[PDB]
Design a protein around this ligand. Structure first.
Ligand SMILES: N[C@@H](Cc1c[nH]c[nH+]1)C(=O)O
Ligand SMILES: N[C@@H](Cc1c[nH]c[nH+]1)C(=O)O
Ligand SMILES: NCc1ccc(Br)cc1
Ligand SMILES: NCc1ccc(Br)cc1
Lengths: 407, 405
């Protein structure tokens, strides 16, 4: 036998498992459409150079990389955001702003799972917190669409600008801010900061432990950018009607080098699962890639695995069996030609329909119809045919119907 | 600057290019649904062992393979069919037959494009030619759905059983039939496999026969291939796609595993490579170690040649992005109210933007036009006090909040 298991850490999606994935992706797509985002895609294979950010990120530590037969350093993308930036930088002046782009790429890692799908939503060319508002509202909308409520989940919201000011007031070089964020994201965090380069660590921990925006304002001032932006953010989400879904949490920084402003992450209010989604503003990324002009950006990722766990726990993922509208059944093999004419008609009318492909008895054909979840069984028999009719039997007992009135 | 071009032989899909791909995939999905096929997927990364068929196939010659950190021989799949067989073999007795499965995997090669998407449709557990009929009809349906006619395209149909009999009558070992097919798909190479001149003569003669009647004269009217091809053409005629299909004795396909009927789509102007290709492969699962033979048939249908053909025929106009509503705050003090409006529009199943940054109404209106909005909803202080907004159709007057949706 060949090996029937998939390659290490990768998932197969037979029809049953595919329907669950599809149910999830339908929401991601529908939510994107509702919010006016445009789909894009790019190759899963990118140059390794795209991910060399040198901040000790977990994501760059766990890259699935390899050398081509030809000697080029490539990787299966660990995330989509750098691919987006490449595309954005490639368009340059021709890209009309603002742009709202989304995708549902498979992303990879090498360390149980080595592979996941990740819905990406990003807004490009919008300076103000309305971008973050929309992004956060989109993530809530998706969760709501899947059956979750604000009692089940929330989004923790913070700004990295608070921590920046604290770090900056200690005379810490600006090039050290990203590593600090990668570290603070994680008693070992006390040791790692010293290595980057005690009273400064004290200050960091104190501010991240502050439990409200008012307490942040006491420390850095009420007119500080972070305070004004967070207040605007919460005012807008309230106005949109999702105030119960969002809250402030000063310990949220995220693990990625490139966030500059507001950052956020989704969570289950039972404290059972890892983050459902995560994102933030990254206004400097395109400048680091070499854009001659700064390009504001903000966005999030939303993985396909944790959400499914949460939906299973909450009993929101019942198996939806396969369905088809009609199953056409030839009474015997001499009726196959006529049955195919019927099948054609049903499909021309926009119906989903099978025809019994092999030779079998009517009752077995009827059973197969039930197994594939047919709403209706269409028996094509000699006597009915002469009368310009077929027999129809609803499965969701039996009578003749004219060919013209089936559809 | 970082490199803005994609990795060698790979395509970017910015929104414009993505809409074209989406238009194509919508047809593949809709056709699958119409025909009652179920979606599946599997990892793009598979074990290299999965593709070692030893017939000198072009597909196994051009594998995108590499060694993991850990020393495992893996590959980016060159095709989906072996992944399907793996899944099928994994299920074994638990899989209810017949099964009709489809997918739209990206597949890879290393040699020019190194990457394409390929719609796969396969029928499992059906012995008779009705499987091939449905598969061929599904491919025609997809092309028809995209705007093509039987004047633009067709499907050439043959059976490998004819060539099998000829090869077999020359005393050629059964294990040589797949290599012979891989070669005939493309004089010197057959001799190397082990065939003398008279056997090559016979091969070429039969592949040059232009009708099923001429095949019957050579191998008999009772021969499996003749009965099956006649049944096949009778069924496609009955389904109403007779103008789309024809017999061509030179069609064998390049893959090792086809055993019976094979087919391929083509443009009737002779400009393009094959649009799609498939056939019956009844032995594949036996070779993977299935304790019982499992009949299978299917096809692949790439995303690149079809698009070329559709561009030539002028069937791929750019469809610009569209959204139903663009909500415009008169100024920043109206943003909260505008968000309440935005919420309502989206709750009602409408696609809607709100102007995110600070800008003047006329510029907001321009942006609305650029993103292809059907309707612009201006949220101004004076209208708001009256429980109203201003609505302007794009593709001006006051409207009550309740009657927008
Ligand atoms: N790339 C981020 C998510 C993101 C998308 N856009 C902005 N941020 C992550 O994987 O965590
Ligand atoms: N694997 C074949 C297509 C196919 C799918 N199923 C059967 N055949 C190809 O790439 O040509
Ligand atoms: N964001 C968590 C996560 C990242 C990568 C993979 Br692969 C799986 C999960
Ligand atoms: N079926 C032709 C083809 C095969 C592989 C790639 Br990649 C592209 C086209």
């Amino acid at each position: 036998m060949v090996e029937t298991e998939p390659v290490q850490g990768c998932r197969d999606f037979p029809p049953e498992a595919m329907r669950c994935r599809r149910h999830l992706f339908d929401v991601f797509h529908a939510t994107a459409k509702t919010f006016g985002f445009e789909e894009y895609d790019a190759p899963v294979l990118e140059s390794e150079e795209l991910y060399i950010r040198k901040a000790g990120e977990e994501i760059t530590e766990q890259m699935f990389n390899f050398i081509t037969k030809g000697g080029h350093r490539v990787a299966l993308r660990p995330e989509m955001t750098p691919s987006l930036a490449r595309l954005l930088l490639g368009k340059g002046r021709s890209l009309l702003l603002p742009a709202k782009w989304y995708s549902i790429p498979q992303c990879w890692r090498y360390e149980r799972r080595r592979e996941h799908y990740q819905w990406n939503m990003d807004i490009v060319g919008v300076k103000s917190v309305s971008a973050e508002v929309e992004l956060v509202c989109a993530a809530c909308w998706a969760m709501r669409s899947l059956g979750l409520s604000s009692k089940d989940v929330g989004i923790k919201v913070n700004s990295r600008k608070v921590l920046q000011t604290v770090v900056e007031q200690a005379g810490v070089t600006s090039d050290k801010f990203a590593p600090v964020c990668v570290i603070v994201d994680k008693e070992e965090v006390e040791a790692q900061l010293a290595v980057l380069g005690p009273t400064v660590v004290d200050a960091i921990t104190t501010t991240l432990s502050l439990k409200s925006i008012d307490e942040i304002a006491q420390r850095v001032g009420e007119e500080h950018e972070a305070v004004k932006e967070l207040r605007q953010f919460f005012e807008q989400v309230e106005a949109y009607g999702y105030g119960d879904w969002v809250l402030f949490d000063a310990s949220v920084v995220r693990g990625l080098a490139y966030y500059t402003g507001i950052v956020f992450e989704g969570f289950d209010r039972e404290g059972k699962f890892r983050a459902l989604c995560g994102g933030g503003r990254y206004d400097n990324l395109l400048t680091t890639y070499g854009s001659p002009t700064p390009i504001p950006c903000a966005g999030f990722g939303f993985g396909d695995c944790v959400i499914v766990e949460l939906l299973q726990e909450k009993r929101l993922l019942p198996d939806i069996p396969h369905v088809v509208d009609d199953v056409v059944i030839p009474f015997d093999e001499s009726m196959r030609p006529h049955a195919l004419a019927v099948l054609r008609r049903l499909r021309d009318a926009g119906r989903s329909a099978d025809i019994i492909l092999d030779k079998k008895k009517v009752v077995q054909a009827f059973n197969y119809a039930d197994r594939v979840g047919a709403v209706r069984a269409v028996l094509v028999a000699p006597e009915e045919w002469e009368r310009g009719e077929v027999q129809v039997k609803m499965l969701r007992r039996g009578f003749a119907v004219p060919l013209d009135r089936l559809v």
